[PDB]
């Protein structure tokens, strides 16, 4: 089997991407944030505290002929932005892009935090990290990808995120038309449950490439690129008037600037992030201070190759017995 679904940015900044997902019978279509940095498939639901729902489409298990309570199971999750949700669990049929899984754990939110409530465009998350991170208790559940594996033509999914444009998530195949050149594969550690890999270095603009090992995770659910403070300082030093602002929460730069590109290494290959991708616009409406898309990972405890980095590439998440990541330019 295969599946193929379009993913669409939620706003003009590419703050996140949503992908339609069919849940239940008859189908209930919800727009989920596919997150390679977590392992729960959770949704706004008919169970979600009413004051915490503001415009999201909800899953109603009582209207699905294939829904069944997973008796006794609960879940509770916290994300890197400090957001959270929790609830109970159903099993149901879930389809993405024509690929169907029966018996998928669909985590129904009873409570979501204010960041979720305030974002009417995201109806839930679909986790694509390793199932060892799934929060369901007392019986941990598998991700959609882990349940679909048995069945896929190739045990892979790919992320092809757009810059200010739609992109694609494919399951079970490589679309050799979607990238240029060759795909460079690199080793993955699953020890922390993430798609964790080691970049071979970086360059700033037209500068020389610095060979240096940078461990981090490939995380479609994180907007920005978070790297060590040394690397980030070297990048923003090339932008006149850029500075780290404790009041704003990271590096800011004059909106009048033209940003340099940022290159990261994948083995002997190089992925170039255009300068424009690193612009996250005014810090507040009408400000001439703009927020940077490359930020320090210091205090976060891990480096994160979020959407800023990933949307510069065609990315293969290879879930074979020995998982690997692949990157190609596009
Ligand atoms: C609506 C919304 C969108 C995204 C986030 N961030 C997540 C994905 C939870 C994270 O992993 O930091 C929180 C709320
Ligand atoms: C273990 C380790 C790994 C990498 C580096 N280099 C850094 C600090 C990322 C750089 O800025 O070049 C240093 C130590
Ligand atoms: Na922000």
3D architecture notes:
The chain has 330 residues and is mostly beta strands. It folds into two domains: 5-174, Beta Barrel (Cathepsin D, subunit A, domain 1), CATH 2.40.70.10; 175-330, Cathepsin D, subunit A, domain 1 (Beta Barrel), CATH 2.40.70. Helices cover 7% and strands 43% of the residues. It has helices at residues 114-118, 144-148, 229-236, 307-310; strands at 3-9, 17-23, 28-35, 41-43, 68-78, 84-96, 99-112, 124-127, 156-160, 167-171, 184-187, 196-204, 210-218, 225-227, 243-245, 250-254, 262-266, 269-273, 279-282, 289-292, 294-296, 304-305, 314-318, 324-328. The strands form three sheets. It has a seven-stranded mixed beta sheet. Strand 17 and strand 18 (269-273) form a beta hairpin. The radius of gyration is 20 Å and the shape is globular. The two termini are 25 Å apart. The site of one 2-methyl-N-(4-methylphenyl)-L-alanine has 13 residues, from strand 3 and helix 1. One 2-methyl-N-(4-methylphenyl)-L-alanine (R9J) is lined by residues 210, 212-214, 228, 230-231.
Quick overview:
Residues 17-328 form the Peptidase A1 domain. The protein has 2 domains: 5-174, Beta Barrel (Cathepsin D, subunit A, domain 1); 175-330, Cathepsin D, subunit A, domain 1, CATH 2.40.70.
């Amino acid at each position: 089997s295969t599946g193929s679904a379009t993913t669409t940015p939620i706003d003009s900044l590419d703050d996140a991407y949503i992908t339609p997902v069919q849940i239940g019978t008859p189908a209930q279509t919800l727009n989920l944030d596919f997150d390679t940095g977590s392992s729960d498939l959770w949704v706004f639901s008919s169970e979600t505290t009413a004051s915490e729902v503001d415009g999201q489409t909800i899953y109603t298990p009582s209207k699905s002929t294939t829904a069944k309570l997973l008796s006794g199971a609960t879940w509770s999750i916290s994300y890197g932005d400090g957001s959270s949700s929790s609830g109970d669990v159903y099993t149901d049929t879930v389809s993405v892009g024509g690929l169907t899984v029966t018996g998928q754990a669909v985590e129904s939110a009873k409570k979501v935090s204010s960041s979720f409530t305030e974002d009417s465009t995201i109806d839930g998350l679909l986790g694509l990290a390793f199932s060892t991170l799934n929060t369901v208790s007392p019986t941990q559940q598998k991700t959609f990808f882990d349940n679909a594996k048995a069945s896929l033509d190739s045990p892979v999914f790919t992320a092809d995120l757009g810059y200010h444009a739609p992109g694609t998530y494919n399951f079970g195949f490589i679309d050799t038309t979607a990238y240029t050149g060759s795909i460079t594969y690199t080793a993955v550690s699953t020890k922390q449950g993430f798609w964790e890999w080691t970049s071979t270095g970086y360059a700033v603009g037209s500068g020389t490439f610095k060979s240096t090992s940078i461990d981090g995770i490939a995380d479609t659910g994180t907007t920005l690129l978070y790297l060590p403070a040394t690397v980030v300082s070297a990048y923003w030093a090339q932008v006149s008037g850029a500075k780290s602002s404790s009041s704003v929460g990271g590096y800011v730069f004059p909106c009048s600037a033209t940003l340099p590109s940022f290159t990261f290494g994948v083995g002997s290959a190089r992925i170039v992030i255009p300068g424009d991708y690193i612009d996250f616009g005014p810090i507040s409406t009408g400000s001439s201070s703009c927020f940077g898309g490359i930020q320090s990972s210091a205090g976060i405890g891990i480096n994160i190759f979020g959407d800023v980095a990933l949307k510069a590439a065609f990315v293969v998440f290879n879930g074979a017995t020995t998982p690997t990541l692949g990157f190609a330019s596009k």
